[PDB]
Design a protein around this ligand. Structure first.
Ligand SMILES: Cc1cc2nc3c(=O)[nH]c(=O)nc-3n(C[C@H](O)[C@H](O)[C@H](O)COP(=O)(O)O)c2cc1C
Ligand code: SF4
Ligand code: SF4
Ligand code: SF4
Ligand code: FES
Ligand code: FES
Ligand SMILES: [K+]
Lengths: 87, 214, 263, 432, 45
């Protein structure tokens, strides 16, 4: 339920081939850049970071929580069906 | 019996043949009419009470049958049954002994009463007689704490009750005769034992202290 | 317009009338500790960890169900508010079994994270612990009721979200056994999401049981293709394979729920 | 004007003149006492009169709430919102020490139901939903016959007491609990639900049951309403001190020679009630070690503080306790105060509904640590530890049972502290 | 008629059958006003 992760921007890459080591069943990987993510407060700096080294670039807009119209008396109604069946 | 999960036993199973006698449908329809339509879940309490006064317990079959006759999901029936005290899901031995054990009663030594029906009847707390007459449980206050340690037998309680008073109460009880409920001593309902103090002069007439039109 | 004015530990903020204290806190960025309230799952008010003291209060208000009005300074970091959180959490944690090494919730458990942020650093318990008998409601989600803290988040989820009335809290006192009382099964098409709403390891996925731990699971963002709904989901990958699938936050498509087939 | 010598309640001063059921408890004796008279007039006078009469009456919360009922009955007195208004009488009486309403329900139910209808006019309700206790089966049938003789006579029902008023009164016999004693868990018991204290707001006033406005009152509080509205609220308010206006059916029990639920003049020192009306206590004033003042939730009071204090709401509050339901329980030196509240706190654990964690977890934790206290299996710092958690569950609970559990142990800690230390000293000494 | 001091007139509490509360319950339906309607007869409807 905590949200102290939905507040920054990251710099994740595309995953590449991950094969098992013949001896010990590792995850030998030839992608040097796979295990690297940056942290950006806002977004246009994150993109401003993106083009200055010229990486293939796309974004995703922040899925902001819509305001949930909460209530407690709705669970005890007279006509509306929001009467809770257990408490 | 201290088991809030239901074991599917061959006797108490959803296949157990529970139903209502012709009078009950008049009784349970009297339950539903007492409340406004739209919210008739209120009847889950007295309908389950009706089964208490017919089967002597609440088999899982009774709760399941209550579900559709109440137009409620079966679990809401279980929740009502499992919480409240004498909604017993387990067979009981004819007469249910509810000895009042809470502090005001034990202060006048409910343990003497508890020891009295313990040794005389010969079964431990929460158990039943070998041939199903008595079941003693150490209940708390039912609402008569002023009197001596209480015993609530089935539906009729016995107050102002002494350990010597308890053995004679169950003396006739095992013979089938029910004793008079209420305070067992000379106290009738709530007057002091050493003579009544209040309620001396006749009550005032019908209507007093008129405030003009009133 | 009609947005009533109110303070939050100092700074003031306008807010729609009828809004509860919790929903007024995050307007500035306050995630007040909660354990029985989900923003899209009714309002319970039983965990009492949302308890925050209002200004000039004689008693701590339950931020979940208290509608706020004019001039109520939310005393978030107040001593009493932290005192209320400290006491109420130790009560939750009191009967909690010592299963963190063996519980899959370890590493992503709200009970663990809360105790790190808003919690003590030792124990004052010197008694035994409650032992709730386990249940069985399907092969898709495990049931360990000793770890439960009776947040009742499941029974609301079944009642409204899943539309099925098969969860409840039988018993009394310390003996709040949340389950089905009778032997029953729970395979609603959204019954798989019952895992995520559970703040503890009481409900966990049998297929994912004892397979991975949260810190190693690299996360990726993808879509559901089991159904034409195209639900947004996050795929867990560790050491080069997939273990479990979680629904993503998308109010339009899936909210935070996915079908059992997808999970 | 101010009769500081409060006491010696007269029979007319007892609004329940048949609370003992000595004379005809049925409808045939009710109108003889003064019931069912002039009621037609007071209903036709309008709701403001009962509100006006109860203002000078000053009848406070007699169910342990300790709130002036004149305000609460007028709290929700608003024009019709479409949703019908209802009434509820808190006939639970599950406290270990509450018996007066049990006597009232068994012997004086007609003035109770009349109180519902005269009150129902005040709050504009159309039906009463008194929650009679399930264990009270015999007295349940007692007010159903009281229900019977009143409905066909026009006193209650359609044209309630002949005033163009459709107020009714329904009965819900319980199935056993104390949590349903509090109104917020009481309502769910009627509302086809297991007893769970509802969170306020929404309050019972604006929306009580099935989503409609409802009023919750203690049995006597509505029962005294027609009596105070007939003879005069100021006469009722004469009894007791400021905001202690009125009398109370004191529930004398415990180590007392003649326990009796006596409707006696209220705001009176306990020395008078134990001796004059209860015929002394077991062993006298010397014998008694402490007394439960007015209820199990109210912390017990020892002889050191209860040597002079008057049994009134205000003096009880400053006595670090409450008068509550006037459930006075006497207890002597022979009984141990720890074993006394041991059974009391065990009963609290046997009741808690488990909704909010402080009551669900703390009370059981209280039971385990206090069980050690009976023998003495705790170090001296545990009393402070027990005090700490007692403050932790105080007020933090959804309902008042959680603090209702804090007060008795809190009072025991502050009063018999050396007793705990020496009992623990004997524990380690005998088990060295 | 004269005021009594040692007479209990509540013998009915002793002589109440098992269904006595139900016996009065089934038959006070005559004095019943039309119960309020919720716009529907159940909150799952
Ligand atoms: C645990 C608990 C038990 C209660 N039991 C009762 C009861 O048995 N009878 C009662 O009248 N009030 C009881 N109350 C008080 C009610 O919550 C409520 O304050 C009361 O019915 C108000 O009555 P009044 O409106 O006449 O003042 C209880 C409260 C608590 C917290
Ligand atoms: S649910 Fe959380 S606190 Fe409980 S055992 Fe699992 S990780 Fe530990
Ligand atoms: S099992 Fe989980 S979701 Fe269900 S009540 Fe317990 S903690 Fe809440
Ligand atoms: S204090 Fe909390 S757990 Fe106890 S009865 Fe009240 S709501 Fe239930
Ligand atoms: S003390 Fe015996 S009934 Fe409460
Ligand atoms: S959020 Fe208020 S109690 Fe869980
Ligand atoms: K979980």
């Amino acid at each position: 339920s905590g949200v102290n992760n939905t507040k920054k921007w990251k710099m994740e890459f595309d995953t590449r081939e991950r094969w098992e080591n013949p001896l010990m069943g590792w995850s030998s990987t030839a992608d040097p850049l796979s295990n690297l993510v940056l942290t950006f407060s806002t977004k246009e700096d994150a993109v401003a970071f993106a083009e200055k080294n010229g990486w293939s670039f796309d974004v995703e807009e922040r899925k902001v929580p819509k305001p949930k119209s909460k209530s407690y008396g709705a669970n005890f109604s007279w006509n509306k069906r929001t009467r809770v069946s257990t408490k | 019996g201290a088991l809030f999960v239901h074991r599917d036993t061959p006797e108490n199973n959803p296949d157990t043949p529970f139903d209502f006698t012709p009078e009950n449908y008049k009784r349970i329809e009297a339950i539903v009419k007492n409340y406004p339509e739209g919210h008739k879940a209120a009847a889950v309490l007295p309908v389950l009470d009706l089964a208490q006064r017919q089967n002597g317990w609440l088999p899982i079959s009774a709760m399941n049958k209550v579900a559709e006759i109440l137009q409620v999901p079966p679990m809401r029936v279980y929740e009502v049954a499992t919480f409240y005290t004498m909604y017993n899901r387990k067979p009981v031995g004819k007469y249910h002994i509810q000895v009042c054990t809470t502090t005001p009663c034990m202060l006048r030594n409910s343990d003497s009463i508890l020891e009295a029906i313990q040794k005389k009847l010969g079964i431990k707390v929460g158990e039943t007689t070998p041939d199903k007459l008595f079941t003693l449980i150490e209940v708390e206050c039912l609402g008569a704490c002023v009197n001596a340690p209480m015993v609530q037998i089935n539906d009729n309680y016995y107050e102002d009750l002494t350990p010597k008073d308890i053995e004679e109460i169950i003396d006739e009880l095992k013979a089938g005769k029910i004793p008079k409920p209420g305070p067992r001593s000379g106290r009738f309902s709530c007057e002091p034992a050493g003579g009544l103090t209040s309620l001396t002069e006749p009550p005032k007439g019908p209507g007093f202290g008129v405030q003009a039109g009133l | 317009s009609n947005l009533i004015e109110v303070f939050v530990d100092g700074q003031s903020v306008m807010v729609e009338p009828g809004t509860t204290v919790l929903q007024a806190c995050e307007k500035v960025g306050m995630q007040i500790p909660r354990f029985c309230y989900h923003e899209r799952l009714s309002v319970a008010g039983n965990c009492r960890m949302c308890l925050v003291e209002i200004e000039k209060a004689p008693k701590v208000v339950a931020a979940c169900a208290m509608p706020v009005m004019k001039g109520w300074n939310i005393l978030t970091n107040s001593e009493k508010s932290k005192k209320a959180r400290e006491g109420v959490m130790e009560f939750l944690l009191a009967n909690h079994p010592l299963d963190c090494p063996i519980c899959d919730q370890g590493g992503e458990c709200d009970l663990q994270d809360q105790s790190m942020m808003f919690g003590s650093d030792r124990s004052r318990f010197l008694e035994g612990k409650r032992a709730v008998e386990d249940k069985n409601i399907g092969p898709l989600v495990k049931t360990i009721m000793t770890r439960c803290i009776q947040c009742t988040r499941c029974i609301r989820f079944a009642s409204e979200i899943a539309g099925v009335d098969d969860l409840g809290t039988t018993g009394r006192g310390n003996d709040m056994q949340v389950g089905t009382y009778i032997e029953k099964m729970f395979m609603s098409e959204l019954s798989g999401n019952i895992i995520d709403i559970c703040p503890v390891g009481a409900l966990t996925s049998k297929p994912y049981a004892f397979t991975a731990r949260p810190w190693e699971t690299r996360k990726t963002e993808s879509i559901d293709v089991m159904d034409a709904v195209g639900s947004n989901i996050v795929v867990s990958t560790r050491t080069g394979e997939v273990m479990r699938i979680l629904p993503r936050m998308h109010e339009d498509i899936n909210e935070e729920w996915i079908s059992d087939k997808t999970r | 004007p101010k009769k500081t010598s409060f006491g010696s309640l007269k029979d007319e001063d007892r609004i329940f003149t048949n609370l003992y059921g000595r004379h005809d408890w049925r409808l045939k004796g009710a109108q003889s006492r003064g019931d069912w008279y002039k009621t037609k007039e007071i209903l036709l006078k309008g709701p403001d009169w009962i509100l006006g009469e109860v203002k000078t009456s000053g009848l406070r919360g007699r169910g342990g709430a300790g709130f002036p009922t004149g305000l609460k009955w007028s709290f929700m007195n608003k024009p019709s919102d479409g949703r019908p208004k209802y009434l509820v009488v808190n006939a639970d009486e599950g406290e270990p020490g509450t018996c007066k309403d049990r006597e009232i329900i068994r012997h004086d139910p007609h003035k109770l139901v009349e109180g519902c209808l005269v009150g129902g006019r005040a709050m504009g309700a159309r039906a009463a939903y008194i929650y009679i206790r399930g264990e009270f089966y015999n007295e349940a049938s007692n007010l159903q016959v009281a229900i019977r003789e009143a409905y066909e006579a026009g006193l209650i029902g359609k044209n309630a007491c002949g005033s163009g008023y459709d107020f009714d009164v329904f009965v819900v016999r319980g199935a056993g609990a104390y949590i349903c004693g509090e109104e917020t868990a009481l309502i769910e018991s009627i509302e086809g639900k297991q007893g769970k204290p509802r969170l306020k707001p929404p309050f019972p006033a604006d929306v009580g049951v099935f989503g409609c406005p409802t009023t919750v009152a203690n049995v006597e509080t509505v029962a005294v309403s027609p009596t105070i509205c007939r003879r005069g609220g100021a006469w009722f308010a004469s009894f007791g001190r400021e905001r202690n206006s009125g009398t109370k059916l004191f529930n004398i029990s415990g180590h007392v020679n003649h326990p009796c639920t006596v409707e006696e003049e209220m705001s009176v020192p306990l020395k008078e009630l134990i001796e004059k009306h209860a015929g002394g206590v077991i062993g006298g004033w010397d014998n008694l070690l402490a007394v439960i003042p007015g209820g199990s939730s109210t912390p017990l009071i020892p002889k050191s503080v209860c040597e002079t204090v008057l049994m009134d709401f205000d003096a009880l509050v400053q006595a670090q306790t409450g008068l509550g339901t006037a459930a006075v329980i006497v207890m002597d030196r022979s009984t141990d105060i720890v074993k006394a509240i041991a059974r009391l706190i065990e009963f609290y654990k046997h009741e808690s509904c488990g909704q909010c964690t402080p009551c669900r977890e703390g009370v059981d934790w209280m039971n385990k640590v206090m069980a050690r206290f009976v023998k003495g299996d705790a170090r001296p710092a545990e009393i402070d530890s027990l005090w700490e958690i007692s403050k932790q569950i105080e007020g933090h609970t959804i309902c008042a049972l959680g603090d209702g559990a804090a007060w008795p142990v809190q009072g025991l800690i502050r009063h018999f502290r050396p007793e705990l230390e020496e009992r623990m000293q004997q524990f380690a000494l005998q088990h060295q | 008629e004269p005021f009594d001091n040692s007479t209990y007139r509540n013998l009915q509490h002793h002589e109440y059958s098992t269904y006595t509360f139900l016996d009065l319950n089934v038959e006070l339906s005559k004095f019943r006003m039309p119960q309020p309607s919720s716009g529907r007869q159940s909150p799952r409807h």
